[PDB]
Amino acid sequence: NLFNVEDYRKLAQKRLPKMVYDYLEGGAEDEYGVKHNRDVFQQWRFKPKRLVDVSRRSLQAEVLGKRQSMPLLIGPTGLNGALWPKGDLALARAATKAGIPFVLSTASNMSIEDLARQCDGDLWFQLYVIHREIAQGMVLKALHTGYTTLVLTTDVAVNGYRERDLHNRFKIPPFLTLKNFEGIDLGKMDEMQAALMSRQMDASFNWEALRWLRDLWPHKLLVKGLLSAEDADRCIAEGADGVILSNHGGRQLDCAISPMEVLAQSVAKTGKPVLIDSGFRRGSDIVKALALGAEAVLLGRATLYGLAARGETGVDEVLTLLKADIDRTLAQIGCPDITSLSPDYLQNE
Amino acid sequence: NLFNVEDYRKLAQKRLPKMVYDYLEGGAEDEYGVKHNRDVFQQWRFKPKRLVDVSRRSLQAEVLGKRQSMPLLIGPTGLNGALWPKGDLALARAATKAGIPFVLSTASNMSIEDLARQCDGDLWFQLYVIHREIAQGMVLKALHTGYTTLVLTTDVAVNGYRERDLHNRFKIPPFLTLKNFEGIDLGKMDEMQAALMSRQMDASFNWEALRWLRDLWPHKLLVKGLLSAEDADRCIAEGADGVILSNHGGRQLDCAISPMEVLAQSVAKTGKPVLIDSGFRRGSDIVKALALGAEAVLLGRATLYGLAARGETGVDEVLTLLKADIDRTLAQIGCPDITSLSPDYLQNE
Amino acid sequence: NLFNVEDYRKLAQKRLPKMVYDYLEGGAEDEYGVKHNRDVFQQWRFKPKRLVDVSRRSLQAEVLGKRQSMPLLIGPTGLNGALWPKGDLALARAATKAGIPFVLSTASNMSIEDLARQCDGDLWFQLYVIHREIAQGMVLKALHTGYTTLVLTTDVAVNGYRERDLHNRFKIPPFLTLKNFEGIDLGKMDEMQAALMSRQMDASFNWEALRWLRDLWPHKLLVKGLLSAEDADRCIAEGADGVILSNHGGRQLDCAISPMEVLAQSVAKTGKPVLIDSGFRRGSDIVKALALGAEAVLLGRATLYGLAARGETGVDEVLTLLKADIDRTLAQIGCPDITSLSPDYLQNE
Amino acid sequence: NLFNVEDYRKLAQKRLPKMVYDYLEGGAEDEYGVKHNRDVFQQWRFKPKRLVDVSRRSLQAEVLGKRQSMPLLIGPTGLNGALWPKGDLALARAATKAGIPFVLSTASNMSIEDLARQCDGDLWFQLYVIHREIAQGMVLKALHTGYTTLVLTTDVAVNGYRERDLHNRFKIPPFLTLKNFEGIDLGKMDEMQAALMSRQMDASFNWEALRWLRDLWPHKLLVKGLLSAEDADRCIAEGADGVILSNHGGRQLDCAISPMEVLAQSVAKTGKPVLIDSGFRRGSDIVKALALGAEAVLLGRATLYGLAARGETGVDEVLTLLKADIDRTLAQIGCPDITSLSPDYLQNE
């Protein structure tokens, strides 16, 4: 009985040790955030347009100007190897077979260059800045190995207070190593940035630092973790090619608004691509966001449930159900072409 | 203990095999739709008018200009034979004894001409278009056998994702055959529309196609499955004599609005009869809709519970309770004549 | 543990046979009405006024111009004898000891003249009109025996559909007889109004009939069962000295609004005393209504729980707790004199 | 597993006898008040500001013009000795080690002068007026022993109806004595204010009485128990240096609004420090209040859970978690300096 994402979550819960499952499903503090991420979608309902010819439908769409099979992406999630062996490759291959980009996390278990060597799909790289110089190295690595777009996630200045992990004394499984930080120096002055091997990131990274990153990277640049049209607009003003509204899937700040709450506003104010993630499980959630103007939706836990439960095949499976889910929804609301979606198909509840 | 519709649902659940019961009660995906269909009625409460003489009450009303015993109809539901032997006849006979129309489904187990031959009540025919030519045949059949009004349901361009059926591997019971598609050709060119024996309808049927249907049928024409005043108005502009606001009882699109949400607007904009279904269980739900301007309410599952539980007699029983329910409500709110209902008797909550 | 009304309900449920308890606690259809009657009070919260001298408090108040100990009344409830022997007397005596009026029901187990003979408190009479002439007899009886005010309840044109009673085949207990209809004629022409010994009232009683009643009764006249400022205002225009907003404690129309929803409006429009009942259990509910302008609150089930659980003493007990409850609330919100209550002490939620 | 306040409540429930636990956790009547106190915080969510340098954060803040480690205080709670031996000292010492004030209750188990003798932190004194002359004595005592600020709580004109205590026949534990009322007179005329040894306070204390208190005390004066901007403003007009919006943690009036409902208004109207308590458990609740303009938040039950569960160490523990909680929240919303908080970081839900 694997007919939707929730079915995959259930199977994933059965196969993962409790501690790993909690680490994946868990959110910050009371988890009112993850709940809100799901509940916010009920604020909109569909007003389908009847008697529209939907015999020929299209989910094809440009994201940052580049055509892909559907406006979905497998977003950046770290420690995927803890969910399934070579999790990073499995995810990237499923995304490639589906015709959509895959975003590699700075905390991946497979290195930037190894994935590129083993997968020919559209690869994006998600950057966490712990040490500027180290960040510069990874960015150039990604550039030199053909990663098409850079994603700066800015919502982990400090670690989220996830109590499930605290109660389980969650210790990052043995085998899992942060590959991208592998083999890095040890001079005695020419430097002790080695001190920067902590569990905390550079809490000082700011707008000026973004300019630095902007000059460093030549291709499409996105800023992830935004929760206001004002921040999204500033990002564009500073050179970003688009943004990813997100609350990190409820794992950072339990009382953060859902990105869906500032989606329409960010789209109207920035005039640039506004991607989004956090809370997406049903094709309907996805269509609601696209209808409000989102360029694309990034999947977090949805595809991880497929990975955890059945590896690569599970990811392929989750993506085909979601694709068929989206397609079916378009037919039902009378919007044959996904690029024609508009607020017109929605009713605020 | 058979005092209301819910009591009949309970008895029906006891008598039907689980798989058939799930197929009947089930909705699309999370079933937030069927729930919403029920919950929306709580958005209105009654403000009765006291000291009104209600010693003589009338539920009589014209629907599409034709008087009937009460503004209710037994709506189109397919595979009624799966709920009770000769389900279609049982329903039609109960409706006839009650003085209200019965709508035969394109997917009925009794043929268009057989029902007409065995029942003298007001018979309506509900059309699903799978193959144009086949549709034309059924429409002419219905015309020639005395069906008074034609109903085009437009909300099944594609099949609803009903997970209860998927989990039960629901296979349309053996005996049940789609009678109306019986004995149809097999030429080798003069044609393979035989290819059109799938579980999918003509997803291309559009406004132009509606005109075609409009010229084909000479009597009253209604378009069912609408969820916007704009669509309802276009239907009238294209020749329809009225519409049936509906979300197919929550079985097609889980996040569709309830038709009750666009009822008042459709009535004010079209100026033509606006019938409605989806979620009706209590006489109060019915009176609320009539008060908002609905010409009539079509029963879906309510009368099917009566059928499933006690056959024809069960349907008669559900209709007498509902009639007495409506009558009692009119007395209580001080509107002796059902045709005098207005938004004045309601309080938006 | 008898510290509030709910505690008395619990004890009453333990002492009454289930069928009698259901008949008392029950509401119409789904009982969404009784629930709403309780829930509506949460729409207001208190904004107390601090540093006000509340060392000397007063609950004394005029109702229809006549001073009483507190703005409470034990309202009309029929078949009180089914809850406790000589229930009507017990209630009337507790009310008298408390300094508030008691309203005798047309369906009481003790006759109009017997109660007056055995209780010297302020007695009101509640009239149900089944047969005009019979009604005239009771009204004159009440007049001649010293009942101070007449109450016409208008919300039982037809009986409420209470499903608990239907499931229990509730048969009015053996002993209980409708005393006020005792010993009445049997001519053969001079008449068969004997036909009017049914379970249904005069559904034709209207505004003209109210004028008739108005000319018949010389003292204070109140119309009970109103749910709109418009009806309340018409009642005043037709001669009523005040009204009682009420939905009969949720036992008549499950979807009726709570009288609390039209309280402020009725007070502002009529300019006459507006009493109210339906849903009152906590002193806070009572103070909220008084603050919104209600002249007084009638208790229905609250005092019946005291009666059912411990007879007269139980009623005395419920009234002293409620009085102390009200008094304590006045101190806490800083309104020492109950007649100084105003919307100023409330916050709409 | 002691990672947040709720964890300490759980441990406290395990260690305290039920009767003492109920006396601590309990609220007035239905306890809809305490629930509302918690629920109201969900009316706001965070809109963090990204790309802000939060590598250096500050929780330091002035309260009534005096710098302290963070805008928190351990508020006045009586009978602390019933929760842990020498509870008052334990609380005061934990607060002092944390760098924040401690407020001694008039009903403390340790005397005004004994605490001052044993603790050198910032000590505030909370005054309940039962007898004017007795009140004057305590106020002068506090003045002479170095207490920095006086707090008049005005929301106990009468005792709250807490039903948990009534059901448990809660009798103030044996050992616990009201130290501050110790050794006081017994003349025969020069007086029987001895009559004022009841469980009730001076219900007459009013605005004029506040002036009296104002002239008596030379330092900072705060009025606690306010629930309206109008009352808060009057307090300032009468000489108070600030106020403490509060509903006494839901223990006095079950339907009282939460102070959070008049926080912004009180801040805008008075132009003076507006402190607040009632319902605070998560750092997020605290940051929301500060963002709305509160000068500081007083902890009631939160720190008592630490006391009850692990004495002084438990209090130290609750304060370090709360401090780290607040600090983490500031980083996450991008407001490095706690004094820079504004409504800008919130989204009304």
Ligand SMILES: Cc1cc2nc3c(=O)[nH]c(=O)nc-3n(C[C@H](O)[C@H](O)[C@H](O)COP(=O)(O)O)c2cc1C
């Ligand atoms: C186990 C797990 C690991 C994650 N790792 C990262 C990461 O390394 N970098 C990043 O930018 N986001 C990371 N995220 C956040 C995701 O990019 C995404 O914002 C989020 O999961 C979306 O919400 P959803 O899980 O409801 O889809 C992670 C999320 C989860 C659940």
Ligand SMILES: Cc1cc2nc3c(=O)[nH]c(=O)nc-3n(C[C@H](O)[C@H](O)[C@H](O)COP(=O)(O)O)c2cc1C
């Ligand atoms: C078992 C079942 C079969 C149905 N079959 C049909 C059909 O063949 N044609 C059609 O137009 N609607 C069909 N409907 C939808 C109904 O016409 C009606 O819109 C719906 O049931 C109304 O909602 P309700 O079930 O809450 O009353 C069906 C509904 C159910 C529950």
Ligand SMILES: Cc1cc2nc3c(=O)[nH]c(=O)nc-3n(C[C@H](O)[C@H](O)[C@H](O)COP(=O)(O)O)c2cc1C
């Ligand atoms: C058992 C029972 C009997 C009643 N009998 C009468 C009656 O004879 N006449 C009348 O006017 N109202 C009658 N009422 C309605 C009450 O006057 C009153 O409106 C109602 O109970 C108020 O609501 P509450 O029960 O929540 O207080 C009755 C209510 C109950 C629960």
Ligand SMILES: Cc1cc2nc3c(=O)[nH]c(=O)nc-3n(C[C@H](O)[C@H](O)[C@H](O)COP(=O)(O)O)c2cc1C
């Ligand atoms: C057990 C207990 C004792 C209290 N004693 C006092 C007191 O003596 N004086 C006072 O002003 N407030 C007193 N309070 C109220 C507190 O000062 C504070 O307003 C309240 O607890 C804040 O709510 P919270 O408990 O949700 O934090 C008490 C509260 C509790 C729970």
